[PDB]
Scaffold this motif. Structure first.
Motif, PDB file in Angstrom:
ATOM      1  N   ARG A 161     -16.491 -45.743  42.112  1.00  0.00           N
ATOM      2  CA  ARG A 161     -15.671 -45.155  42.501  1.00  0.00           C
ATOM      3  C   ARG A 161     -14.241 -45.465  41.104  1.00  0.00           C
ATOM      4  NH1 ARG A 161     -19.694 -42.622  41.039  1.00  0.00           N
ATOM      5  NH2 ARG A 161     -20.935 -40.747  42.016  1.00  0.00           N
ATOM      6  N   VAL A 162     -13.576 -45.872  42.898  1.00  0.00           N
ATOM      7  CA  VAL A 162     -12.857 -46.086  42.968  1.00  0.00           C
ATOM      8  C   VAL A 162     -12.129 -47.409  41.411  1.00  0.00           C
ATOM      9  CG1 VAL A 162     -10.770 -47.874  43.835  1.00  0.00           C
ATOM     10  CG2 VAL A 162     -12.361 -46.183  45.659  1.00  0.00           C
ATOM     11  N   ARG A 163     -13.067 -48.522  41.209  1.00  0.00           N
ATOM     12  CA  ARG A 163     -13.174 -49.250  39.802  1.00  0.00           C
ATOM     13  C   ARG A 163     -13.566 -48.734  39.211  1.00  0.00           C
ATOM     14  NH1 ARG A 163     -14.173 -55.321  40.141  1.00  0.00           N
ATOM     15  NH2 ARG A 163     -13.361 -56.290  38.089  1.00  0.00           N
ATOM     16  N   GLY A 164     -14.825 -48.149  38.734  1.00  0.00           N
ATOM     17  CA  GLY A 164     -15.660 -47.520  37.296  1.00  0.00           C
ATOM     18  C   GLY A 164     -15.213 -46.580  37.292  1.00  0.00           C
ATOM     19  N   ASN A 165     -14.486 -45.509  37.827  1.00  0.00           N
ATOM     20  CA  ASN A 165     -14.268 -43.726  37.188  1.00  0.00           C
ATOM     21  C   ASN A 165     -12.552 -43.421  37.594  1.00  0.00           C
ATOM     22  OD1 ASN A 165     -17.729 -43.516  39.567  1.00  0.00           O
ATOM     23  ND2 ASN A 165     -17.150 -43.697  37.220  1.00  0.00           N
ATOM     24  N   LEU A 166     -11.893 -44.810  38.041  1.00  0.00           N
ATOM     25  CA  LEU A 166     -10.160 -44.070  38.326  1.00  0.00           C
ATOM     26  C   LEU A 166      -9.903 -45.356  37.479  1.00  0.00           C
ATOM     27  CD1 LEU A 166      -9.905 -43.400  41.911  1.00  0.00           C
ATOM     28  CD2 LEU A 166     -10.305 -41.764  39.885  1.00  0.00           C
ATOM     29  N   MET A 167     -10.113 -46.320  37.708  1.00  0.00           N
ATOM     30  CA  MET A 167      -9.020 -47.270  36.473  1.00  0.00           C
ATOM     31  C   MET A 167      -9.741 -47.599  35.140  1.00  0.00           C
ATOM     32  SD  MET A 167      -7.459 -48.243  39.286  1.00  0.00           S
ATOM     33  CE  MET A 167      -6.612 -48.906  38.807  1.00  0.00           C
ATOM     34  N   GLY A 168     -10.902 -47.377  35.160  1.00  0.00           N
ATOM     35  CA  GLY A 168     -11.838 -46.788  33.808  1.00  0.00           C
ATOM     36  C   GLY A 168     -12.449 -45.839  33.585  1.00  0.00           C
ATOM     37  N   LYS A 169     -12.466 -45.343  32.516  1.00  0.00           N
ATOM     38  CA  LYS A 169     -13.143 -44.378  32.389  1.00  0.00           C
ATOM     39  C   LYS A 169     -13.518 -43.613  30.761  1.00  0.00           C
ATOM     40  CE  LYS A 169     -11.056 -42.063  35.157  1.00  0.00           C
ATOM     41  NZ  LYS A 169      -9.553 -42.265  34.767  1.00  0.00           N
ATOM     42  N   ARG A 170     -14.466 -42.935  30.510  1.00  0.00           N
ATOM     43  CA  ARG A 170     -15.045 -42.594  29.513  1.00  0.00           C
ATOM     44  C   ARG A 170     -13.818 -41.014  29.093  1.00  0.00           C
ATOM     45  NH1 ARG A 170     -18.203 -46.079  29.592  1.00  0.00           N
ATOM     46  NH2 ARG A 170     -20.492 -46.478  28.732  1.00  0.00           N
ATOM     47  N   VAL A 171     -13.074 -41.326  27.428  1.00  0.00           N
ATOM     48  CA  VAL A 171     -11.756 -40.571  27.387  1.00  0.00           C
ATOM     49  C   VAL A 171     -13.009 -39.483  26.407  1.00  0.00           C
ATOM     50  CG1 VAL A 171     -10.448 -42.100  28.250  1.00  0.00           C
ATOM     51  CG2 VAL A 171     -11.198 -41.749  26.093  1.00  0.00           C
ATOM     52  N   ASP A 172     -12.466 -37.926  26.544  1.00  0.00           N
ATOM     53  CA  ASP A 172     -12.599 -37.176  25.214  1.00  0.00           C
ATOM     54  C   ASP A 172     -11.609 -37.874  23.735  1.00  0.00           C
ATOM     55  OD1 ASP A 172     -14.436 -35.887  26.536  1.00  0.00           O
ATOM     56  OD2 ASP A 172     -13.433 -34.469  27.445  1.00  0.00           O
ATOM     57  N   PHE A 173     -12.158 -37.618  22.767  1.00  0.00           N
ATOM     58  CA  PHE A 173     -11.065 -37.295  21.518  1.00  0.00           C
ATOM     59  C   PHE A 173     -10.868 -38.880  21.377  1.00  0.00           C
ATOM     60  CE2 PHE A 173     -10.040 -33.059  23.776  1.00  0.00           C
ATOM     61  CZ  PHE A 173      -9.988 -32.129  22.390  1.00  0.00           C
ATOM     62  N   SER A 174     -12.111 -39.240  21.620  1.00  0.00           N
ATOM     63  CA  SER A 174     -11.917 -40.281  20.905  1.00  0.00           C
ATOM     64  C   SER A 174     -13.187 -40.985  19.630  1.00  0.00           C
ATOM     65  CB  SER A 174     -12.278 -41.719  22.361  1.00  0.00           C
ATOM     66  OG  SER A 174     -13.020 -41.524  23.137  1.00  0.00           O
ATOM     67  N   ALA A 175     -12.878 -41.789  18.796  1.00  0.00           N
ATOM     68  CA  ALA A 175     -13.260 -42.469  17.748  1.00  0.00           C
ATOM     69  C   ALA A 175     -13.470 -43.959  17.796  1.00  0.00           C
ATOM     70  CB  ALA A 175     -13.231 -41.739  16.589  1.00  0.00           C
ATOM     71  N   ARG A 176     -15.077 -44.318  16.731  1.00  0.00           N
ATOM     72  CA  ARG A 176     -15.388 -45.644  16.841  1.00  0.00           C
ATOM     73  C   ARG A 176     -16.210 -45.447  15.760  1.00  0.00           C
ATOM     74  NH1 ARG A 176     -15.188 -51.050  19.647  1.00  0.00           N
ATOM     75  NH2 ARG A 176     -17.390 -52.053  19.342  1.00  0.00           N
ATOM     76  N   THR A 177     -15.911 -46.785  15.102  1.00  0.00           N
ATOM     77  CA  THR A 177     -16.291 -46.601  13.314  1.00  0.00           C
ATOM     78  C   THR A 177     -15.730 -48.008  12.556  1.00  0.00           C
ATOM     79  OG1 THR A 177     -17.290 -45.922  11.345  1.00  0.00           O
ATOM     80  CG2 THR A 177     -15.276 -45.681  12.020  1.00  0.00           C
ATOM     81  N   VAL A 178     -16.337 -48.226  11.934  1.00  0.00           N
ATOM     82  CA  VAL A 178     -16.626 -49.661  11.365  1.00  0.00           C
ATOM     83  C   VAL A 178     -15.276 -49.303  10.732  1.00  0.00           C
ATOM     84  CG1 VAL A 178     -17.253 -51.619   9.768  1.00  0.00           C
ATOM     85  CG2 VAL A 178     -19.000 -50.521  10.855  1.00  0.00           C
ATOM     86  N   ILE A 179     -13.760 -50.666  10.208  1.00  0.00           N
ATOM     87  CA  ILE A 179     -12.697 -50.453   9.281  1.00  0.00           C
ATOM     88  C   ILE A 179     -12.879 -51.472   8.032  1.00  0.00           C
ATOM     89  CG2 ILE A 179     -11.420 -50.335  11.605  1.00  0.00           C
ATOM     90  CD1 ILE A 179     -11.365 -53.701  11.258  1.00  0.00           C
ATOM     91  N   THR A 180     -12.557 -50.973   7.603  1.00  0.00           N
ATOM     92  CA  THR A 180     -12.223 -51.559   5.706  1.00  0.00           C
ATOM     93  C   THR A 180     -11.157 -51.757   5.195  1.00  0.00           C
ATOM     94  OG1 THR A 180     -13.203 -49.276   5.088  1.00  0.00           O
ATOM     95  CG2 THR A 180     -15.137 -50.389   5.589  1.00  0.00           C
ATOM     96  N   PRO A 181     -10.876 -52.557   4.704  1.00  0.00           N
ATOM     97  CA  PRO A 181      -9.173 -52.851   4.420  1.00  0.00           C
ATOM     98  C   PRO A 181      -8.780 -51.311   3.100  1.00  0.00           C
ATOM     99  CG  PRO A 181     -10.959 -53.974   2.331  1.00  0.00           C
ATOM    100  CD  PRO A 181     -11.632 -53.090   3.968  1.00  0.00           C
ATOM    101  N   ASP A 182      -7.738 -51.270   2.686  1.00  0.00           N
ATOM    102  CA  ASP A 182      -7.045 -49.953   2.102  1.00  0.00           C
ATOM    103  C   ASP A 182      -5.781 -50.709   1.858  1.00  0.00           C
ATOM    104  OD1 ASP A 182      -6.752 -47.927   1.108  1.00  0.00           O
ATOM    105  OD2 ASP A 182      -8.364 -46.658   1.300  1.00  0.00           O
ATOM    106  N   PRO A 183      -5.768 -51.173   0.907  1.00  0.00           N
ATOM    107  CA  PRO A 183      -4.493 -51.366   0.140  1.00  0.00           C
ATOM    108  C   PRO A 183      -3.390 -50.463  -0.172  1.00  0.00           C
ATOM    109  CG  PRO A 183      -5.647 -52.341  -1.286  1.00  0.00           C
ATOM    110  CD  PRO A 183      -6.567 -51.635  -0.199  1.00  0.00           C
ATOM    111  N   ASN A 184      -4.167 -49.537  -0.131  1.00  0.00           N
ATOM    112  CA  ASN A 184      -3.517 -47.389  -0.539  1.00  0.00           C
ATOM    113  C   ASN A 184      -2.726 -47.586   0.365  1.00  0.00           C
ATOM    114  OD1 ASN A 184      -5.335 -48.077  -2.904  1.00  0.00           O
ATOM    115  ND2 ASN A 184      -3.700 -48.420  -3.746  1.00  0.00           N
ATOM    116  N   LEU A 185      -3.150 -47.681   1.806  1.00  0.00           N
ATOM    117  CA  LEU A 185      -1.757 -46.896   3.105  1.00  0.00           C
ATOM    118  C   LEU A 185      -1.046 -48.174   3.733  1.00  0.00           C
ATOM    119  CD1 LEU A 185      -5.662 -46.258   4.329  1.00  0.00           C
ATOM    120  CD2 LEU A 185      -4.253 -44.876   3.734  1.00  0.00           C
ATOM    121  N   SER A 186      -0.342 -46.820   4.133  1.00  0.00           N
ATOM    122  CA  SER A 186       1.319 -48.053   4.148  1.00  0.00           C
ATOM    123  C   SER A 186       0.639 -48.423   6.368  1.00  0.00           C
ATOM    124  CB  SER A 186       2.213 -46.484   5.341  1.00  0.00           C
ATOM    125  OG  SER A 186       2.663 -46.121   3.920  1.00  0.00           O
ATOM    126  N   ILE A 187       1.391 -49.380   6.135  1.00  0.00           N
ATOM    127  CA  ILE A 187       1.436 -50.383   6.995  1.00  0.00           C
ATOM    128  C   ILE A 187       0.579 -49.166   8.654  1.00  0.00           C
ATOM    129  CG2 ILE A 187       2.418 -52.303   7.053  1.00  0.00           C
ATOM    130  CD1 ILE A 187       4.750 -51.450   8.684  1.00  0.00           C
TER     131      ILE A 187
END
Ligand SMILES: [Mg+2]
Ligand SMILES: [Zn+2]
Ligand SMILES: [Zn+2]
Ligand SMILES: [Zn+2]
Lengths: 257, 48, 477, 44, 115, 64, 98, 35, 49, 192, 40, 240
Positions: free
Chosen positions: L12-38
């Motif tokens: 609990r102290v280490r696996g559930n307080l220092m780090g934990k799953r969070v809502d409102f997060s997304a993950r997918t592959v990244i691809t280039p887009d030279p048409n976007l701003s930095i």
């Protein structure tokens, strides 16, 4: 300030390809013509398949994929055919689509080749181009393929199956007088079939005042349209794209004022 | 360091414990800087 | 040695080692010794003669096989311990031929140096022109490519299976690929690949794919997911059975539609499915009966391919359901050549947008030129050059690693005979404007592979999801 | 509710209650028959 | 899952204007034409025709994003010439040229087919 | 598994050339000669038949 | 009866032994399938070769950390009997001790 | 008589082809289990 | 314990012709998982009688 | 955005033509490598005839290895510089190196002139066999070919022995990468 | 000669140990021995 | 036992307080887009249509948020929930009846993520500050995260299968924190080495070298094309 006066010299005209040269034109106009050949010339292709029976070794949307890529004769019927979206029918009717039927059952020890010859349309005008025939699937004894499909209007901008060309060769300045391409070693580069240089010569002398003109085309047809019909449809299609834009532009200008 | 004809100023060691017990904590602070800088700058990298 | 070569008392796999310095002869007969066949050399000559080759040529209808070479004493197996006492010639035509006497006591010769490579490294074309780590990376990528993993894949019901619509054998191939059956079951397609910086969408190991080619089935593949569920009668009170739950019969049922299920609780083949659908309707009797039906993941969206019903090893009725899902290549999907050049699809351009040659050929794949210089995968450039000669010549190119009969200059000279620049460069025109590109682009056929890693299998989002009851923290639902 | 035998490919109507088995073959691997419902494919 | 329909590249959705004109305040006699559901086919041909106009000081187009289907055409004209007027004259010239090309290609087809 | 209908690169029809291509090879034509006889000039289309593997033939060796 | 041995496919004791390619297709088996694995609860299991030091061979190694200057070990095993291998060490004690 | 260098490349791969006609690629697994 | 004494991840000279020099997983398993060369053979054993 | 759209006109590629060098440049590289091998042979003869005097702080073996390595290291540099000078303004390998976008001088030289000496743990290829690196050499062969000096470029291709020694040298890079991934952030989480 | 560098040397510093892997000194000479090789 | 619950890396102290799953997060592959701003990240529509931001209802946005509620989950951009002044949550897709969906000041509408939304974009391992930078969301029509080619260097990211995490700040206070502290432009120069952390990269770097050569000359049409991509351009064509 005004339009070009382009000229056309057709060099070869067969049932498969048309080779022609356009002169006194801008590069943008020449290029936009070849993009319309590929992406904006409407033809008829199968875009709807219901498979009633498919015991073959290829799954259902494998067969449907192959059906869509079969070229259908759409030379004159395409012009009078409507887009299903534009048509007011209940998603399909003779004015916006052509129905196809395929019902093949294999009952012989010999492998049964289901080809485009087995595709049967309710419109005699729209038939598979090959009718050697295009192989759809090979059937073992006891395997059957029963389906009905609809062929509708579309152009290559939506899917490659509505692209009427089997290759659009486009060229200009074959001798590189404009130096639009710089060869590190011009001697290593073969002469263009349109080149007008001697064997010793490798590049035309640089033409600082020159402009891209005299564009060479070789429009090869898949079979849906005649190669000349593709070019004529492209010119009218590109012209319609601009006339439509002008009509919309006129209203926008009026609204602004 | 006590050896004759040996520079008692510039002579140093790469052992932090040896420096701590011979020169002091402040000498360690300077020696640790130099050891930490040497490893970082070995490949040409720079850290503020 | 004589007895082993005659196979009289000493079997072929027996290794005899003499340590001359230590005055010891070690004979090993146990298992687990790794050995390879080597041609025997006597008096600076191969015991393998034309007569042996001629008999092998008529391998069938002659009963002559590899075992006759071993029995004839022309080839023998050498283990690592014996290899320390072996003076080995890499080739007969060069090593034991009369020349400056580097060594005149060769005892064995290699059949071919390219047999040092394994199965996955044996499909790399020109692996001796690549930086070694890139050969290691490809051996990893080759095992993740798509193709036809086994011919009878329709009968099989595997948890996960990827089948490419149109596998092709490489235009440029290795001699070893004949024995891997890579020709019979290929994993990839020969792609017209241009090495150019077109619009910046292939940067940092990304790839620009032709949308028109993708529309035609280029690298289209099937994905089969098989789900197994068994009904267990363990426990007198609870007895789970297959049947579509009904509102009046079962006290608690989810609002998911059960219309897809048949009266036996199993969805029929040929039915579209999604996350909201139930594929298996299993109901457990209470000690009304509670339902314990199985649902699909929201990500999956396919058609039920096959539904088989059996009794498992335990004798319980169980069904395997195979869902079919067609995966069209799209942005984010990983593609790789046979040289460690791995990358995702950055963008897809229609045929009119892609750059084209004077013949109207547009590349299927465009890769960034910046991928080559650091990786030094010159074998990728040679494969494209050889593949260009192969497609034009109508002959499958040979990319066996240590072949002196093949070199870039010889391949280049062949490419000149077909009206192409000898180095594979072509004048490409801009698809958007039609203007000639100032630089001439290296373009030709290269064998690419579609890897199992799809973006759809990876994209996932979380926004106020199903936390755990005990921990009150996020968890998958 | 038709099930196709994996051995002889015999179509036999099987109830939910009765055991799953080929009526004449005796085989114990049964495949469901393709759904009679119509599913549309766009040839894309 | 995020794949867009293939027809979104050329079909206007409800409430979308094919072309909109916005004045460019940076420079006088400059306008920005945002044309929806168009690509380099019309942007390049229109832009090149504009450059043939001696009263057009600046003409350029761009696709802001390949995944989107808008082209922005910027036209700056002389004080006595309107950017909208330059745009209309540019399209008429292109239509005139295309119409002339149709006629002359049709004549060429007859010549080649005749013999 | 089966010959593609169109060449991927250019969209030329290739689905009606596999049987003819096999027939030409049986007629002692070289692979290049057969492709030329079939009208496959662009190496993109020659790639289609030169590198095709017809797995549908062995898939039919399994009874339905 | 004393038990059942899992059988490696396409081995001499497999049912698909000596069957011609046509026969394999009749059984819905891929002729190109190489075999060499086991089916355990329907899962195709492959036994990975485990690399280990040869037995009955005298190996002399040197360990700096340990207290022996040199150690000559020999893992002795019978000729296919008593699978357990007994290792004997003959180590020369280090000279570090003063 | 003897395999000349101009015939060696063909010859060596006939020897290699015969080896895989007899052994295959998983002969180690099957031979070990048969023993 | 044996692997600790000497590192087996490195490609040893003696793997020539026996183990593929290129094929090895990347990550924690570099050099520990190996693959036979095509003509590599592992002896099944026989009696020395 | 501005230069990504000018590159549509200029274009940038890389191909076989960029990996080639002039026949004169190839001759110069061959002469350098041929002379470098002879220089190493002479150093071997001095050691064999006991005419090699160890340098201070090094044993005879270290002295010989230092002398051999510098000869081969110099040869790689001499051939590498020669290959770079042969490159034209149009060469695309040079353009990416000159701009700093990707690659370096060593990459160009390896592709064009010589891959160079392969090292395991900082030394030439060890005698893993009994006094041999491979069974294809004589015992006690300290020449460049025996000990892992690749005399070919990637364009020319490596010989079977060079291919294996290059694999041995390349395995060291693979192992180091795995270690760094394991060590990545370990110090950071201790300091934090 | 060779001394620890990189992460392992960085590890030693933060992990201060009575015994480093490669302990060493850098002695400087302040007499004529500094400029005289024989005296050094 | 109780001691076991706390002990371990997953305690609990280490696996559930220092780090934990969070809502409102997304993950997918990244691809280039030279048409976007930095400082801009392209986001798939599905990810945007799934992650929401709670907007407090104000007379400034009462009508705009009312429309999103009407559109609902069915149409993107819409909304998923309504939080009344009571703090109770209403699931929109269940019942879109506008009578029960009237908004008033103090209500929070959890509208779908839209263009211009601030997100924290992260590539692991997170080694330094530039491994978690703030971006402006840009909805794009496929299933990958897009990155400007310049921000790949600070992230140590490549487009060969890399995946990156997207975290969406859920309040105005934390949203302002990312804007003023963690956006990419504010991270251009790193305090670690007092030098820029991202620069010009492969194609743009190779091309700018060619572009700046003494013998590169641009015609009138070409220059007008390059000026269309100069957002800061003042509109005056320079004297050739
Ligand atoms: Mg990566
Ligand atoms: Zn209608
Ligand atoms: Zn039966
Ligand atoms: Zn083609």
């Amino acid at each position: 300030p005004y339009a070009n006066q382009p000229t056309v010299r057709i060099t070869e005209l067969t049932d498969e390809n048309v080779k022609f040269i356009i002169e006194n034109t801008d590069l943008a106009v020449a290029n936009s013509i070849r993009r319309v050949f590929i992406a904006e010339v409407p033809i008829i292709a199968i875009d709807w398949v219901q498979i009633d029976a498919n015991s073959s070794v290829l799954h259902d949307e494998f067969i449907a994929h192959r059906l869509g890529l079969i070229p259908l004769t759409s030379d004159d019927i395409v012009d009078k055919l409507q887009y299903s979206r534009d048509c007011t029918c209940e998603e399909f009717c003779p004015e916006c689509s052509v129905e196809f039927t395929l019902d093949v059952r294999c009952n012989e020890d010999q492998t049964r080749h289901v080809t485009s010859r087995d595709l049967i349309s309710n419109s005699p005008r729209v038939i598979p181009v090959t009718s050697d025939d295009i192989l759809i699937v090979k059937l073992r004894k006891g395997q059957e393929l029963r389906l009905r499909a609809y062929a509708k209007k579309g152009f290559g901008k939506e899917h490659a199956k509505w692209n009427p060309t089997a290759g659009v060769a486009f060229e200009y300045d074959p001798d590189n007088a404009l130096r639009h391409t710089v060869y590190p070693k011009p001697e290593e580069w073969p002469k263009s079939e349109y080149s007008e240089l001697d064997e010793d010569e490798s590049q035309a002398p640089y033409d600082p005042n020159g402009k891209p003109e005299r564009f060479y085309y070789n429009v090869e047809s898949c079979g849906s349209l005649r190669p000349e019909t593709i070019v004529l449809s492209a010119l009218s299609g590109l012209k319609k794209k601009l006339s439509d834009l002008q009509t919309q532009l006129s209203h926008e200008i009026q609204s602004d004022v | 360091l006590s050896e004759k004809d040996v520079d008692p100023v510039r002579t140093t060691s790469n052992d932090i414990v040896e420096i701590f017990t011979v020169l002091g904590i402040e000498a360690v602070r300077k020696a640790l800087e130099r050891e930490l800088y040497h490893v970082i700058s070995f490949d040409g990298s720079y850290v503020n | 040695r004589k007895l082993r070569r005659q196979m009289d008392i000493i079997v072929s796999e027996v290794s005899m080692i003499r340590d001359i310095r230590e005055r010891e002869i070690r004979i090993y007969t146990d298992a687990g010794r790794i050995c390879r066949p080597l041609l025997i050399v006597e008096k600076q000559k191969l015991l393998l003669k034309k007569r042996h080759i001629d008999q092998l040529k008529e391998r069938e209808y002659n009963n002559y096989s590899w075992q006759d070479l071993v029995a004839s004493g022309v080839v023998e197996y050498i283990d690592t311990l014996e290899e320390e006492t072996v003076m080995l010639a890499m080739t007969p035509d060069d090593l034991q031929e009369k020349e400056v006497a580097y060594c005149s006591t060769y005892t064995h010769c290699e059949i071919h140096p390219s047999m040092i490579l394994g199965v996955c490294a044996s499909i790399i074309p020109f692996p001796d022109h690549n930086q070694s780590p890139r050969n290691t990376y490809q051996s990893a990528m080759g095992k993740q490519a798509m193709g036809v993993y086994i011919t009878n894949f329709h009968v099989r019901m595997d948890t996960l299976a990827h089948v490419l619509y149109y596998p092709q054998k490489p235009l440029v191939t290795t001699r070893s690929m004949e024995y891997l059956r890579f020709r019979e079951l290929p994993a990839g397609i020969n792609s017209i690949v241009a090495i150019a910086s077109y619009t910046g969408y292939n940067q940092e190991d990304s790839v620009i794919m032709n949308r028109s080619a993708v529309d035609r089935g280029f690298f289209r593949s099937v994905f089969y997911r098989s789900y197994k569920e068994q009904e267990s009668k363990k426990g007198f009170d609870q007895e789970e059975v297959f049947e579509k739950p009904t509102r009046e019969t079962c006290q608690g049922m989810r609002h998911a539609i059960y219309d897809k299920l048949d009266d036996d609780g199993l969805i029929a083949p040929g039915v579209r499915v999604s996350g909201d659908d139930v594929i298996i309707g299993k109901t457990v009797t209470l000690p009304t009966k509670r339902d314990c039906s199985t649902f699909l993941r929201t990500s999956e969206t396919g058609i039920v391919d096959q539904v088989m019903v059996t009794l498992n090893q335990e004798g319980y009725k169980f069904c395997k359901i195979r869902v079919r899902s067609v995966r069209i290549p799209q942005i984010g999907d990983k593609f790789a050549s046979r040289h460690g050049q791995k990358g995702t699809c950055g963008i897809q351009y229609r045929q009119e947008d892609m750059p084209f040659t004077c013949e109207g050929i547009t590349p299927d794949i465009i890769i960034n030129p910046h991928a080559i210089p650091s990786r030094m995968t010159i074998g990728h450039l040679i494969e494209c050059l050889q593949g260009k000669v192969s497609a034009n010549k109508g002959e499958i190119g040979d990319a066996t690693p240590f072949n002196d009969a093949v070199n870039v200059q010889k391949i280049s000279n062949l490419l000149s005979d077909y009206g192409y620049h000898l180095r594979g460069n072509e004048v490409l025109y801009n698809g958007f404007t039609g203007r000639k590109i100032t630089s001439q682009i290296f373009i030709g056929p290269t064998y690419y592979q579609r890897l199992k890693h799809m973006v759809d299998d990876k994209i996932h989002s979380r926004a106020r999801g199903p936390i755990q009851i005990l921990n009150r923290q996020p968890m998958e639902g | 509710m038709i099930y196709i035998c994996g051995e002889c490919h015999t179509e036999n109507e099987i109830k939910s209650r009765d055991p799953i088995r080929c009526r004449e073959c005796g085989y114990r691997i049964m495949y469901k028959k393709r759904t009679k419902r119509l599913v549309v494919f766009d040839a894309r | 899952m995020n794949a867009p329909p293939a027809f979104e590249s050329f079909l206007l959705f409800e409430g979308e204007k094919k072309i909109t004109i916005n004045k460019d305040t940076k420079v006088p006699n400059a306008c920005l034409f945002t044309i929806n559901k168009e690509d380099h086919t019309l942007g390049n041909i229109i832009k090149s025709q504009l450059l043939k106009d001696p009263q057009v000081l600046f003409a350029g187009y761009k696709v802001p994003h390949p995944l989107e289907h808008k082209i922005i055409i910027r036209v700056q004209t002389t004080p006595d010439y309107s950017p909208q007027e330059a745009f209309t004259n540019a399209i008429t010239d292109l239509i005139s040229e295309l119409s002339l090309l149709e006629e002359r290609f049709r004549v060429a087809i007859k010549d080649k087919q005749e013999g | 598994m089966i010959i593609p209908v169109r060449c991927f690169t250019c969209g030329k029809i290739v689905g009606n050339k596999w049987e003819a291509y096999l027939g030409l090879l049986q007629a002692e034509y070289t692979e290049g000669d057969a492709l030329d006889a079939l009208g496959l000039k662009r190496y993109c289309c020659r790639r289609m038949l030169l590198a095709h593997v017809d797995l549908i033939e062995k898939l039919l060796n399994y009874a339905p | 009866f004393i038990g059942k041995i899992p059988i490696m496919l396409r081995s001499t004791y497999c049912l698909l032994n000596g069957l011609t390619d046509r026969d394999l297709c009749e059984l819905n088996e891929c002729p190109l399938d190489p075999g060499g694995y086991f089916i355990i609860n329907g899962s195709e299991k492959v036994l990975i070769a485990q690399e280990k030091m040869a037995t009955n061979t005298v190996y002399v190694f040197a360990k700096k950390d340990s207290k022996y200057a040199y150690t000559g070990e020999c893992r002795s095993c019978l000729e296919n009997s008593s699978r357990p291998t007994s290792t004997i060490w003959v180590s020369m004690l280090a000279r570090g001790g003063q | 008589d003897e395999i000349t260098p101009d015939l060696w490349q063909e010859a060596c791969w006939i020897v290699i082809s015969s080896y895989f006609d007899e052994k295959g690629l998983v002969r180690q697994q099957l031979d070990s289990f048969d023993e | 314990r044996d692997g600790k004494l000497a590192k087996p991840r490195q490609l040893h000279n003696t793997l020539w012709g026996m183990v593929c020099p290129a094929e090895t997983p990347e990550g924690h398993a570099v050099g520990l998982v190996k693959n036979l060369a095509l003509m590599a053979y592992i002896s099944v054993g026989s009696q020395p009688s | 955005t501005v230069i990504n759209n000018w590159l549509l006109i200029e274009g940038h590629t890389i191909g076989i033509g960029d990996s080639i060098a002039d026949s004169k440049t190839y001759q110069d590289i061959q002469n350098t490598i041929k002379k470098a091998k002879q220089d190493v042979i002479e150093v071997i003869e001095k050691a064999h005839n006991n005419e090699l005097e160890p340098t201070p702080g090094n044993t005879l073996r270290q002295t010989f290895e230092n002398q051999v390595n510098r000869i081969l290291n110099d040869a790689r540099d001499k051939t590498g510089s020669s290959a770079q000078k042969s490159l034209s303004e149009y060469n695309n390998f040079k353009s990416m190196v000159v701009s700093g976008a990707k690659g370096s001088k060593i990459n160009i030289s390896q592709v064009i002139a010589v891959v160079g000496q392969q090292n395991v743990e900082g030394k030439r290829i060890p005698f893993g066999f009994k006094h041999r690196t491979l069974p294809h050499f004589i015992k006690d062969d300290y020449g460049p070919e025996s000990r892992g000096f690749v005399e070919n470029s990637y364009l020319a291709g490596l010989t079977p022995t060079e291919f294996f020694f290059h694999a041995m040298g390349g395995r060291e890079g693979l192992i180091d990468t795995a270690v760094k991934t394991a060590e990545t952030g370990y110090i950071q989480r201790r300091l934090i | 000669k060779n001394v620890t560098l990189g992460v392992p040397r960085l590890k030693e510093l933060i992990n201060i140990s009575k015994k480093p892997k490669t302990p060493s000194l850098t002695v400087f000479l302040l007499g004529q021995s500094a400029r005289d090789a024989e005296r050094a | 036992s109780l001691k076991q619950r706390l002990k371990g890396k997953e305690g609990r102290v280490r696996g559930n307080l220092m780090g934990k799953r969070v809502d409102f997060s997304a993950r997918t592959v990244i691809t280039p887009d030279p048409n976007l701003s930095i400082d801009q990240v392209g986001v798939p529509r599905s990810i945007a249509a799934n992650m929401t931001f709670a907007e407090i209802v104000t007379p400034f946005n009462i009508d705009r948020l009312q429309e999103l509620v009407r559109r609902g989950n069915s149409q993107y951009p819409g909304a998923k929930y309504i939080i009344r002044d009571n703090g109770d949550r209403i699931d929109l897709r269940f019942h879109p009846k506008p009578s029960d969906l009237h908004l008033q000041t103090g209500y929070k509408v959890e509208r779908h993520m839209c263009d211009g939304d601030i997100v924290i974009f992260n590539r692991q391992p997170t080694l330094h500050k530039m491994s978690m930078m703030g971006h402006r969301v840009r909805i794009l029509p496929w299933s990958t995260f897009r990155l400007n080619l310049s921000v790949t260097t600070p992230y140590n990211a490549d487009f060969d299968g890399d995946e990156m995490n997207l975290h969406l700040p859920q309040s105005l206070e934390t949203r302002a924190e990312i804007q003023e502290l963690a956006m990419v432009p504010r991270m251009i120069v790193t305090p670690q080495s007092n030098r820029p952390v991202m620069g010009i990269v492969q194609d743009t770097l190779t091309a700018v070298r060619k572009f700046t050569k003494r013998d590169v000359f641009l015609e009138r049409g070409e220059v007008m094309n390059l000026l269309m991509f100069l957002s800061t351009w003042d509109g005056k064509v320079p004297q050739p």
